[PDB]
Amino acid sequence: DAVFGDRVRRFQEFLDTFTSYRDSVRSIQVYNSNNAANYNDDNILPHRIIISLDDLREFDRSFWSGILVEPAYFIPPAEKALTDLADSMDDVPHPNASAVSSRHPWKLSFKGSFGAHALSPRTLTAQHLNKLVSVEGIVTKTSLVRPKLIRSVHYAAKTGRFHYRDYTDATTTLTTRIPTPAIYPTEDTEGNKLTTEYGYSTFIDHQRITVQEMPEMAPAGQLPRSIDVILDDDLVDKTKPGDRVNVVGVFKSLGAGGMNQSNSNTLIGFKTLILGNTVYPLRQMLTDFDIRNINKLSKKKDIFDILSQSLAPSIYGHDHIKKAILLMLMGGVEKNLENGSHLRGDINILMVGDPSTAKSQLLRFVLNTASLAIATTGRGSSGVGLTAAVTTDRETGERRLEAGAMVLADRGVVCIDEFDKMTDVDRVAIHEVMEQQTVTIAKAGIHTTLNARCSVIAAANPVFGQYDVNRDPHQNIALPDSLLSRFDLLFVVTDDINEIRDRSISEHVLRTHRYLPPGYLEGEPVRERLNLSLAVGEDPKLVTIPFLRKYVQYAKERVIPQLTQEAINVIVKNYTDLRNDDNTKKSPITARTLETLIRLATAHAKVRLSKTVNKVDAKVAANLLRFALLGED
Amino acid sequence: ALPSIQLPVDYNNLFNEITDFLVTFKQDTEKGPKYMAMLQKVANRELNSVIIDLDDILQYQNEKFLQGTQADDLVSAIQQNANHFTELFCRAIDNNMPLPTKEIDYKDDVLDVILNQRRLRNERMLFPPNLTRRYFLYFKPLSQNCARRYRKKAISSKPLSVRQIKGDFLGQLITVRGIITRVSDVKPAVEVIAYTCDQCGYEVFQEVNSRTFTPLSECTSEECSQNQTKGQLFMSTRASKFSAFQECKIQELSQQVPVGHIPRSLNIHVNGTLVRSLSPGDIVDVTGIFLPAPYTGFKALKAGLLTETYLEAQFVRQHKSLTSDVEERVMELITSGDVYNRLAKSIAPEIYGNLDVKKALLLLLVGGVDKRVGDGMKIRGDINVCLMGDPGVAKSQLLKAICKISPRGVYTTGKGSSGVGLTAAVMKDPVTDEMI
């Protein structure tokens, strides 16, 4: 009534006080308008802006406090004012055939500092209901996208006029209203037959996601907790399972909560939900300074050595394995070939070695430094847990598929630990993914082929406790030959007792164990708790890790080298020399070694930020594979 | 009650323009109207389907623009809403149906006998028109070539995917590209139901416009108005009109799925002569109307305002013998010479070597004599070829390649799936839960 109009006036004043929002409205409007005029087209921007809570805090403390504390009485007044401003801006007429019926009202999004309203799915209780909150977590489950009716239009014969009926739901609006039965009117007020006219009605896409707490922040002895978020309109399909997200929305109650005709019970409570306003991913955009630095650092001669050594500075030695990991990070170029085939561009590495040889501390580093990485353990995994699982969608009722570890890491890496301890029934599935890079599901009436293009790095142990040099290589490794053929580089690492090596490595380890984080006193235990302050503002030389991430991203997305003849000449001579020799290698040499040389050469070419494969790339690939197969170093 | 809104579209002028377009339209390139020719063809019990082209409608609009008189952009009205224009066009066809010009040929048509028997008793001593109809009306999507010829852009024929189908496209005419995975059998769906009434008046007709209905079972004729309890209605199948119905599922192609996601699926309903146009395993481009399903019955309450959806199909565009031509192809290949070596060599030209293996695969491709000896003896002509050898010798390209040559072939692999010996007699098919 009066309060609604007063708040509309307040927000209207706020809008012309700061001119940025008015300019963004015009930019979106002109973009959408002149896009439709391009008949010879080469797509549509949604009606949603992002305002900062901070600026509103200086403008009007009362309105900011109302939005943060009582959103359900201050957001709808703001949306009407934004719609009015947007309607005022659009001077050009749009006599469209059916856009007159559906207005697509403008909505709002928020950013800035939330103070005490930044929480997690665990610290959210009944004290935060009907409040604007932001929750950080990991997406686990998503529902199928369905259309929902918002307004129905009917045509009346013998009169020629139209009649519309509006529908509302608890999840649709922020205010509780009288419910609607969602049944189309059939009789006019005068009794004339009504015909439903699809194409003038309004439907909106609806989705439900589940956000779980980060497992690293959970208390001792407790399992992580999860919450449900509802997305609508233009927020649909902006998240996938496994993603790390931050969702800003209104925490809301729903239902009757067992205080009704049903029997009295202590086990019945209310249901809680979040109507998300905004979603933020917790792709690093690069400026011209960063790109210029990358191009300047590319021209240095010893760039490969620096890049490889920058990996895991807390590991002493293992230079060649660290080079192989870097070559994994910058994968090869995939070739699509006739007969529906593709040559894989991924590099797969296996490490077999003695106990306590820093095999498992490199997989953990790859988990952190890479863009996408999935961790797996041999004994705690199953075949149905790696490829896909048949489940049900509670909200709609169909039967669907849920992704597994391999398919969730498409265009990523999978790090498997204790690979030899995996059961045989489990080990067949990974075989297919390593060969075809596709999963075939033919269960419960769901016949589908799923794409899985991932790089595999694995660590295992020999049959006995330690590697034996007096026995043949195949006796030492329990893995079958078919599985072993699918790895590009097999590294056998051994711990040998030598006084100088021990003196150096012990010094390095003792130096590492004496590190104090900044801002901590001696003897002060590390407080890895953050004190519930999740965030302050809601949205020889070595190189730093973020710079390496930028370098890897830029190389993967900007250069695609092509093979040359003079590199092929080196590759063929290396292959012919390696094949025809009496040296006893730890792995047999076959016709698939040539493809490994090609892939390593392509990766080294990408490292140099060049569009051609040179002779030096072939030499580096040859040296790496000679070290891997022979140990001639 | 129900508020009222003003919309630009008026159906009276649209109906006038449809009537004008049916009569006036001529193919500019038989002479005369294009569609009154095929209507006369229909009237002779020969054509079972009527297909309208929106390119032709644009041609009529362009003719009117040449005259300069205003039009109602019928092509845009069809695209924005198409469930009502089907009935409008059906009425327009019914109004201007030509007379049977030749070969009336009434032989044993049960509906014809019923209708003819009605005339004598009705005249000596108003039914739903759809009962007398036989033709089926389908629309044809726009063409980019004609569009680019007259600009105006195009939306109905753009090859969208299952995933790009949002809720804003409901009630429009669109096209979807995908692969057909499942197709069901053809079953009859009722359109007009006729009830016979204990020699009370005569049979009554009701139309059905949903997937679910209720029987009448009460005779309301003037002679049946007498008060005595007399009995309910019984359905008569012969005087009722049925239709062929089929449902299929289309799935998104692997190329169009983004990384980390699972492909979606869409449902297609086809009625009429268009039935059986799609088979499993075909990559097609299907045009139709995208409509909301009612989702009623059980589990409707939990959804509340959530609906299913489906596509009423109207057009199909599949992307991809003894004759003198093949009689001459074999002669040409004979004159080519070196048939043995060339046939063996061209098999998988990527792989270099193993030429004797390629000779043997040719002999496996052809089959030996299968002679049925008397007294029960039989001799096999099929070929059993096993290829052993060390790993990494091109073992498993050679095989796959041979599968391409012969259409009747299956590539079966290890214990990942059980298909070699899966001659099972139990099949828990979800559709009906009976063994196959």
Ligand SMILES: Nc1ncnc2c1ncn2[C@@H]1O[C@H](COP(=O)(O)OP(=O)(O)OP(=O)(O)O)[C@@H](O)[C@H]1O
């Ligand atoms: N070269 C090294 N530099 C630094 N630390 C090392 C090195 N080698 C081993 N370590 C230390 O040894 C410990 C165990 O290493 P890690 O868990 O990686 O071994 P592993 O090869 O996975 O062993 P396992 O065979 O028992 O599974 C860690 O504390 C790690 O820091």
Ligand SMILES: Nc1ncnc2c1ncn2[C@@H]1O[C@H](COP(=O)(O)OP(=O)(O)OP(=O)(O)O)[C@@H](O)[C@H]1O
């Ligand atoms: N004669 C040949 N001509 C061309 N390529 C060959 C030849 N022999 C082997 N190859 C190579 O071998 C590969 C094809 O066979 P592949 O090693 O993939 O499977 P396979 O022989 O069935 O072995 P596995 O036991 O590993 O499955 C390709 O890399 C191909 O280039």
Ligand SMILES: [Mg+2]
């Ligand atoms: Mg370990």
Ligand SMILES: [Mg+2]
């Ligand atoms: Mg093989």
Ligand SMILES: [Zn+2]
């Ligand atoms: Zn009767």
